């Protein structure tokens, strides 16, 4: 009952040619275990999309350290990175670990990302080792915000693949690597993301529920989104959509990500 894979490939290749870049995807029907990929094992820059996994790493650490989420972090006289919309307002109050995690995921807050990487997760190396610990042998985070966003073609630093991103999202959302409380909290955070309205969310009927995390490097036409999608009375779908363009000075396209997502989701004939 699903569409032939080549039909879906054919559609994505036409979309790619109109876009003038590369589109990589991977999707998993968590109920049938049917999958679809296109450029699924090619590396793409993560950009901010790692922050959803950073929030998961924090939750995994809290599952072993009672009360970690409520711990208050203060950062008086810290130089805050560009795009710190939540953390720049909370210097006087500080923020809890839960609030930092929610901010980094839902607002892409860089101050929050680097605070959590410095104080809780152990830097890019620690982020990568969390992903290794869940069986993701592909992901790599090498640099801190914002240097990780350079998106240079051929540079494998700060990259993953659509398949690895989708597989890791599936494990975290639905597998055994996080406890029930932690899963539920992670899903709530993804559902409340604020930066994805023009991407995967724009590809689905408005009564479907979506949790997602975006990435927008700001160079080389490079942008992405990954998500859990809950269609009406169907098993959730996990989807990753990554894009890049060869020229440094091109812009990314939200619409191309939404259109790619629609093509892939339609292929499951839900
Ligand atoms: C500087 C890097 O950290 C960038 C990165 O990646 N982030 C994202 C994103 O997560 O999409 C964005 S998209 C930006 C966030 N706020 C805007 C937004 O939410 N909307 C809905 C337009 C656009 C930044 C450019 C940031
Ligand atoms: Na058709
Ligand atoms: Na990269
Ligand atoms: Na917890
Ligand atoms: Na928050
Ligand atoms: Na940069
Ligand atoms: Na490239
Ligand atoms: Na476009």
């Amino acid at each position: 009952a699903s569409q032939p894979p080549q039909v879906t490939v054919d559609k994505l290749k036409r979309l790619e040619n109109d876009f003038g870049g590369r589109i990589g995807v991977y999707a998993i029907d968590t109920g049938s275990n049917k999958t679809f990929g296109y450029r699924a094992n090619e590396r793409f820059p993560l950009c901010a999309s790692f922050k959803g996994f950073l929030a998961a790493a924090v939750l995994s650490k809290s599952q072993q350290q009672e009360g970690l989420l409520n711990q208050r972090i203060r950062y008086d006289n810290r130089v805050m990175e560009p795009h710190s919309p939540v953390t720049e307002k909370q210097i006087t109050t500080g923020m809890t670990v839960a609030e930092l995690s929610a901010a980094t995921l839902q607002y892409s807050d860089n101050g929050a990302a680097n605070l959590l990487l410095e104080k809780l997760i152990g830097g890019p190396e620690g982020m990568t080792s969390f992903m290794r610990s869940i069986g993701d042998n592909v992901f790599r985070l090498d640099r801190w915000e914002l240097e990780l966003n350079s998106a240079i073609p051929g540079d494998d630093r700060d990259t993953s693949t659509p398949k690895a991103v989708a597989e890791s999202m599936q494990k975290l959302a639905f597998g055994n690597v996080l406890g029930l409380t932690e899963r539920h909290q992670l899903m709530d955070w993804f559902k409340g993301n604020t930066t994805g309205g023009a991407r995967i969310r724009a590809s689905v009927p408005a009564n479907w529920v979506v949790g997602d995390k975006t990435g927008t490097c700001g160079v080389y036409g490079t942008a992405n989104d990954y998500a859990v999608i809950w269609p009406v009375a169907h098993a959730p779908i996990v989807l990753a959509v990554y894009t890049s363009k060869p020229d440094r000075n091109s812009k990314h396209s939200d619409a191309v990500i939404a259109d790619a997502s629609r093509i892939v989701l339609e292929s499951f004939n839900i």
Side-chain angles (χ1 to χ4, degrees), residues 18-19 245 252-256:
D18 179 77
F19 172 53
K245 283 188 187 180
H252 69 275
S253 175
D254 293 336
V256 172

Side-chain angles (χ1 to χ4, degrees), residues 12 15 18 198-199 202-203 254-264:
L12 290 168
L15 182 63
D18 179 77
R199 294 184 186 171
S203 76
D254 293 336
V256 172
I257 294 170
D259 288 349
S261 178
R262 189 181 301 101
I263 285 164
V264 174

Side-chain angles (χ1 to χ4, degrees), residues 45-94:
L46 286 157
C47 319
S49 71
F50 79 96
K51 293 162 177 151
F53 298 130
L54 178 57
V58 172
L59 288 169
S60 182
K61 192 184 185 54
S62 78
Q63 191 184 328
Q64 291 281 101
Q65 186 181 178
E66 199 49 49
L68 184 60
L69 297 181
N70 301 318
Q71 179 182 341
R72 184 167 294 281
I73 288 170
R74 291 174 181 277
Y75 45 94
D76 300 84
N77 200 44
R78 188 176 185 294
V79 175
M80 300 316 277
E81 290 81 1
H83 196 70
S84 292
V86 182
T87 55
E88 74 192 353
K89 318 205 255 209
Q90 308 294 340
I91 305 160
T92 310
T93 59

Side-chain angles (χ1 to χ4, degrees), residues 22 42-45 151-155 220 222 244-246:
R22 263 213 312 161
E42 292 192 26
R43 288 184 175 278
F44 293 77
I152 297 163
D155 183 358
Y220 284 103
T222 294
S244 75
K245 283 188 187 180

Side-chain angles (χ1 to χ4, degrees), residues 9-266:
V9 170
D10 294 339
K11 291 163 169 315
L12 290 168
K13 289 172 54 191
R14 288 188 288 275
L15 182 63
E16 274 189 325
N17 296 342
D18 179 77
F19 172 53
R22 263 213 312 161
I23 304 170
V25 312
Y26 198 74
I28 305 157
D29 183 325
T30 67
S32 71
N33 308 306
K34 285 187 185 181
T35 66
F36 176 82
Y38 175 70
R39 303 185 186 280
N41 300 283
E42 292 192 26
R43 288 184 175 278
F44 293 77
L46 286 157
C47 319
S49 71
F50 79 96
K51 293 162 177 151
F53 298 130
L54 178 57
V58 172
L59 288 169
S60 182
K61 192 184 185 54
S62 78
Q63 191 184 328
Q64 291 281 101
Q65 186 181 178
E66 199 49 49
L68 184 60
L69 297 181
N70 301 318
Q71 179 182 341
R72 184 167 294 281
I73 288 170
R74 291 174 181 277
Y75 45 94
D76 300 84
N77 200 44
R78 188 176 185 294
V79 175
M80 300 316 277
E81 290 81 1
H83 196 70
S84 292
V86 182
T87 55
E88 74 192 353
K89 318 205 255 209
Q90 308 294 340
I91 305 160
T92 310
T93 59
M95 291 177 63
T96 68
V97 167
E99 286 172 343
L100 289 167
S101 298
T104 204
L105 194 161
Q106 301 176 327
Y107 291 88
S108 213
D109 190 302
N110 286 321
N114 282 349
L115 280 163
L116 292 167
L117 287 169
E118 177 190 1
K119 293 173 179 286
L120 263 74
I121 300 304
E125 187 171 11
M127 181 71 251
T128 300
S129 65
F130 175 72
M131 297 302 283
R132 293 289 179 276
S133 83
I134 71 167
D136 183 334
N137 292 148
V138 172
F139 177 101
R140 53 186 290 184
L141 202 73
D142 296 86
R143 291 172 296 168
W144 302 74
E145 289 287 6
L146 281 69
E147 289 81 22
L148 64 87
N149 299 285
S150 54
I152 297 163
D155 183 358
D156 286 339
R157 288 180 297 176
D158 311 297
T159 63
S160 194
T161 66
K163 177 187 300 193
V165 171
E167 287 183 341
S168 283
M169 178 65 134
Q170 176 180 209
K171 290 163 177 182
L172 293 164
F174 304 119
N176 294 333
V177 293
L178 295 172
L180 295 156
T181 297
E182 291 77 25
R183 258 173 274 167
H184 174 69
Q185 181 65 84
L186 184 63
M187 291 302 99
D188 192 67
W189 284 337
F190 277 114
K191 288 172 177 185
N193 181 43
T194 73
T195 64
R199 294 184 186 171
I200 292 169
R201 288 169 191 273
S203 76
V204 296
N207 58 341
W208 297 17
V209 173
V210 175
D212 83 296
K213 177 77 194 81
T214 58
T216 310
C217 280
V219 297
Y220 284 103
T222 294
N224 57 60
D225 197 17
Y226 67 97
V228 177
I229 301 124
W230 290 266
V232 164
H234 189 95
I237 311 300
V238 181
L239 174 62
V241 180
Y242 285 70
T243 73
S244 75
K245 283 188 187 180
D247 190 284
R248 159 65 182 77
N249 305 293
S250 65
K251 294 319 171 163
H252 69 275
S253 175
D254 293 336
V256 172
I257 294 170
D259 288 349
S261 178
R262 189 181 301 101
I263 285 164
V264 174
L265 293 175
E266 283 178 344

